[PDB]
Amino acid sequence: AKTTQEKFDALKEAGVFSGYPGTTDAKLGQDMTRAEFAKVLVKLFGLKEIHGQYSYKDKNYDAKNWAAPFIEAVTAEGLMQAKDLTKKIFDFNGKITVEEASKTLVTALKLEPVKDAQNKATDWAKGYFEAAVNAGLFSKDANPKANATRAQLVEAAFAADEMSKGSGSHH
Ligand SMILES: [Cl-]
């Protein structure tokens, strides 16, 4: 098996991952914004960017925001949602958490959230986190509430890619 760095390099060559902002580097101990993760998902799952539509009210969520076409694509696909449903705030510069990433990936991979999940996750996420751990996307000791490291995100994305590639329909 590949190291995390090798998985990063493979996903970067494939156009799925980028360097930490302002770099081309793996920076495996750093964290990742929800905007960046939306782009990962689009690339990972072959989603279509959506230009000229804005489903959120965040300040500076507009045509000049590079991430909007990706955020809109993951929104249309049902993978990501507002952080604050009432204010329709996506929190694009907020950091993606382990449990948020788990929900995205479980949903994209059509995995069933675990009924009666018992774990550290926030209530809404227990079933998703559980399903993600059971599927090997995150280790059992990951803190669901924590910001995911780039290592964790590389390892999860790489595993989701491998799973998805087991359908003859994979892009
Ligand atoms: Cl989300």
Numbering used by the authors: 28 to 198
Per the authors:
To test our hypothesis that any other amino acid would prevent the backbone flip and impede binding, a SpaASLH/G109A mutant was constructed for analyses. To confirm the structural basis for this reduced affinity, we determined the crystal structure of SpaASLH/G109A alone and in complex with 4,6-Pyr-β-d-ManNAcOMe. The overall Cα rmsd between liganded and unliganded SpaASLH/G109A is 1.73 Å (1.52 Å when excluding residues 44–54), and when the SLH3 domain helices are aligned there is an 8.5 Å maximum displacement of SLH2 Cα atoms (measured for Lys91).
S-layer anchoring is best characterized for Gram-positive bacteria, where S-layer proteins non-covalently attach to the PG layer via species- and strain-specific non-classical secondary cell wall polymers (SCWPs). SpaA possesses three consecutive SLH domains near its N-terminus, followed by a large C-terminal region presumed to harbor the self-assembling domain(s). The crystal structures and binding analyses presented here of P. alvei SpaASLH, SpaASLH/G109A, and SpaASLH/G46A/G109A with synthetic SCWP fragments provide novel insights into the functional contributions of many conserved SLH domain residues, including SLH-Trp13, SLH-Gly29, and SLH-Arg43, which precisely interlock from three different SLH domains to generate two active binding sites.
